[PDB]
Ligand binder design. Structure first.
Ligand SMILES: O=C(NCCCCc1nc(CO)c[nH]1)c1ccccc1
Length: 304
């Protein structure tokens, strides 16, 4: 079986490259971040522009939702993260400490913590309530491309242009595991599978790999897309068929069968690198976003 994702909405408004799109956990909203220093909120189902959230002094690389869909965190080239009240659009805290661009951020499931990755080669864990840094992990020896909590928040995974994926005990900040192959191409993206047993990792050799966390083994490889330059997000689609979803530097959205590794669909429409894709938490909906020749978000819908 293949999905049949078709274009429903093109979301225009960003004046520079989009960097990241993410659906709210309640499925209501899409949040977008951009080089234009703005966060935009859009209706997930009708594509309707809701509001602009402003305050960062330089471009935003990443945005992430709290579990209750009430807060956003953004990661900025201004070396800060900002926690936002989405309803008011107000900046609640500025997270200060990173010594270079903040690239990537995520809330833990409880949403009492935020994890961030920076070009400063550190991973930081922040208290949402106080806005204070709790820990600095000396995580990598090159820029940190991604950070993610597992399903219960007990673990962090990070990836770096140093070619490593590392798994961290959240409570202690101690490294549990380093995923190395024999080569070490830059790791441009990582996240845990919904059940937290696997890690999906992108490398800048046009390759996605599914890793067994517990064993430290590669189970699956997904190829045929273009990824040698950008930190392109990848997703587990779980609402219909079990797919892998990724953008591509050839301006397409790739969708693979998770088990077979076959490409099942290629979504044509963007006029630049598809940097970010997000899978809706309950509907067969994909959001895709493109760099500065395009600057649009596209919403797609499938019957499976
Ligand atoms: O990908 C780059 N710029 C596009 C915007 C950021 C996309 C992004 N991906 C993630 C994955 O965690 C977070 N944010 C980039 C790559 C190399 C050097 C400078 C910038």
């Amino acid at each position: 079986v293949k999905p049949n994702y078709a274009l429903k909405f093109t979301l225009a408004g960003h004046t520079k490259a989009v960097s990241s799109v993410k659906f709210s956990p309640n499925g209501e909203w899409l949040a977008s971040s951009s080089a234009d220093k703005l966060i935009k909120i859009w209706g997930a189902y009708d594509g309707k522009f809701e509001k602009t959230i402003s305050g960062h002094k330089l471009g935003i690389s990443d945005v992430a939702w709290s579990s209750d869909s009430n807060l956003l965190v953004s990661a900025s080239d201004d070396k800060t993260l900002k926690i936002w009240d989405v309803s008011s659009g107000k900046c609640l805290k500025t997270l200060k400490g990173h010594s270079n661009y903040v690239f990537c951020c995520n809330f833990n499931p409880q949403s009492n913590l935020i994890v961030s990755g920076s070009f400063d080669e550190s991973v930081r864990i922040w208290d949402v309530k106080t806005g204070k840094c709790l820990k600095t992990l000396p995580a990598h020896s090159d820029p940190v491309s991604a950070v993610h909590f597992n399903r219960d928040g007990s673990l962090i995974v990070s990836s770096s242009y140093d070619g490593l994926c590392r798994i961290w005990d959240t409570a202690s900040g101690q490294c549990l595991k380093t995923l190395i192959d024999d080569d070490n191409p830059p790791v441009s993206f990582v996240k845990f599978s919904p059940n937290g047993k696997y890690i999906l990792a992108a490398t800048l050799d046009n390759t996605l790999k599914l890793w067994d966390y517990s064993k430290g083994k590669c189970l699956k490889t997904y190829t045929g897309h273009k990824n040698e330059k950008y930190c392109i997000f990848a997703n587990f689609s779980v609402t219909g068929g079990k797919w892998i979803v990724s953008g591509s530097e050839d301006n397409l959205v790739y969708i693979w069968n998770l088990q077979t590794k076959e490409i099942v669909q290629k979504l044509q429409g963007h006029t630049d690198v598809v940097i970010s894709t997000a899978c809706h938490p309950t509907e067969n909906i994909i959001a895709s976003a493109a760099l500065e020749n395009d600057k649009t978000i596209k919403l797609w819908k499938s019957d499976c």
